[PDB]
């Protein structure tokens, strides 16, 4: 239901934040 | 540049995760 | 219970990520 | 420097949020 869908979406959103964060960390190392 | 865009995206992704989490939180107490 | 505690912790963790992200975004602007 | 430390902390915070979210996800299906 809504709660489950919300947590799945949240996890997906966090995954996207993480991959963008990794790109940014690499960019700073240069 | 890429680093700035990445952090902006990450912040937006986290905002999305937070609002879904708040929905889930309310659903639980419901 | 555990689910509620988990979501509260998760929200707190995300809040901490967000404030660190804001510091980083400011640092890049300089 | 500060920017690097901030992103490292943010990434660690998000990791923590994700593991709590996975616990919550399991609790729901339970
Ligand atoms: C990567 C960079 C590049 C690649 C990496 C991919 C992902 C992530 C990073 C990273 C940033 C990079 C670069 C940059 C390119 C490039 C590519 C690569 C892909 C990848 C995807 C993601 C992912 C995020 C990640 C951030 C992160 C930002 C970084 C930037 C730029 C920039 C730009 C490109 C471009 C493409 C495109 C891909 C697309 C993916 C996603 C998302 C999004 C993330 C963001 C965003 C930032 C931002 C932009 C664009 C842009 C968009 C788009 C795609 C999107 C999308 C997103 C963002 C866009 C935009
Ligand atoms: C701020 C910076 C500074 C202030 C801002 C505060 C918060 C956040 C940022 C930011 C980064 C900054 C600077 C830096 C100082 C400074 C201060 C300020 C405080 C604040 C707290 C948070 C918060 C995070 C934020 C990040 C972010 C990093 C940034 C860095 C350094 C650096 C450093 C200092 C120092 C203090 C200290 C405070 C403490 C808070 C938290 C957390 C943590 C966040 C992280 C971490 C990064 C990292 C370190 C330390 C360190 C620690 C500690 C405190 C901690 C803590 C954390 C991290 C430590 C560490």
Numbering used by the authors:
A (entry chain B), B (entry chain A), C (entry chain B), D (entry chain A): 1 to 30
What did the authors write?
In this work, we demonstrate the first ever high-resolution structure of co-assembly between a protein and buckminsterfullerene (C60), which suggests a simple structural mode for protein–fullerene co-organization. As in the protein-only structure, COP forms a canonical tetrameric anti-parallel coiled coil. Each tetramer presents four tyrosine residues (one per monomer) in exterior c positions of the coiled-coil heptad, and each of these engages a C60 moiety. One C60 is wedged between two Tyr residues donated by adjacent tetramers, such that two tetramers are needed to coordinate one C60.
Crystals from the resulting suspension grew within 24 h in several conditions, and three separate structures of the C60Sol–COP complex were resolved to 1.67, 1.76 and 2.35 Å, respectively. Furthermore, the three different COP–C60Sol co-crystals obtained under different conditions all produced effectively identical binding interfaces and assembly geometries, arguing that fullerene may have a strong preference for the observed coordination geometry. The interaction between COP and the fullerene group involves non-polar contacts, with C60 fitting perfectly into a symmetric hydrophobic cavity created by helices of two adjacent COP tetramers. The dominant contact appears to be the π–π aromatic stacking between C60 and Tyr9, donated by each tetramer, while several aliphatic carbons line the pocket to further support the bound pose. The water-solubilizing Tris-acid side chain of C60Sol is not visible in the electron density map. The group likely points into the solvated inner channel of the crystal and is highly mobile as the C60 core rapidly rotates around its centre. On the other hand, there is considerable difference in the arrangement of COP tetramers in the corresponding crystals: COP alone assembles into a body-centered cube, while C60Sol–COP has a honeycomb structure with parallel hexameric channels. In fact, in the fullerene bound structure, no contacts between adjacent COP tetramers occur outside of the C60-binding site. Inter-fullerene nearest-neighbour distances in the C60Sol–COP supercrystal alternate between 1.2 and 1.7 nm. On the other hand, C60Sol–COP supercrystals (of similar dimension as protein-alone crystals) exhibited high electrical conductance (1.40 × 10−7 S, corresponding to resistance of 7.14 × 106 Ω) with at least four orders of magnitude higher currents than in any of the controls.
